[PDB]
Amino acid sequence: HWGYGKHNGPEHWHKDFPIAKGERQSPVDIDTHTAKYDPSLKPLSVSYDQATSLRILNNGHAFNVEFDDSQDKAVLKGGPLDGTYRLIQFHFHWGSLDGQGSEHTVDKKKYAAELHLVHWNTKYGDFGKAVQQPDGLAVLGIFLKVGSAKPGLQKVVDVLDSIKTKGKSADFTNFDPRGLLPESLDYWTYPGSLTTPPLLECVTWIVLKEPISVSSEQVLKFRKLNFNGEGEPEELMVDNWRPAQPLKNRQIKASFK
Ligand SMILES: [Zn+2]
């Protein structure tokens, strides 16, 4: 029964998931004055030309855009990574207000929202096995600020009314996640965790420096989603972000000078 509500939010998660107080928890604040440029980091390779989205899902905590991950179709490689990581899903975290919503922060700046593109290391065969490994997942994180509309988001926005409440899904084929990327692939990277329960410490985080812009109208449609199920008391799906956690014995490394 975890959530982001008044009595079950992030500050409670440790009771059911004690790794919430672990050594490698996410998100974190990215201090741009202490992250060091690492010349050994490679350019990010994002190969999403054959990505096959299948469905969109309200899971009660966010919504997931899903992909067919039964072949190397949509892969992340390079960057900080060894090997090949396959796209399984993307989702967002967002605020009640434009001044909050992101999970990572940049010099304490909160963005309006954050997109997570989740990929699993193909050397472990499936997602469920990958999450049990420290190098099992690669999550590409992208900040959202409110300004211009993102035309490539509009397809997502337009389906949300059909998945208002928890448990609802809808066919969502042919969605191109390349339309959610900023121009630059400059990034920061560090080892961390899933940001929702079970909070497993299995993620190489790759957080892009350049945010995307979405319009106030687009974000407003996110904020009409519901955390409840059909026919239950309305609770708007907003503020579904975990705050920054202690960096502990980690370094944040920059791909760029
Ligand atoms: Zn996430």
Curated annotation (Swiss-Prot):
The record ties this protein, via SMART domains, to:
Carb_anhydrase (SM01057)
Q: What is the effect of changing N59L?
A: Reduced activity
User: What results from changing P198A?
Assistant: Normal CO(2) hydrase activity, but impaired stability
What does the entry report regarding how activity is regulated? Activated by X-ray, histamine, L-adrenaline, L- and D-phenylalanine, L- and D-histidine, L-His-OMe and beta-Ala-His (carnosine).
Q: What is the effect of changing N64H?
A: Enhanced proton transfer
SUPFAM superfamilies the UniProt entry points to? Carbonic anhydrase
Q: Per its record, how is this protein called by name?
A: Carbonic anhydrase 2
By which gene is this protein encoded? Answer: CA2
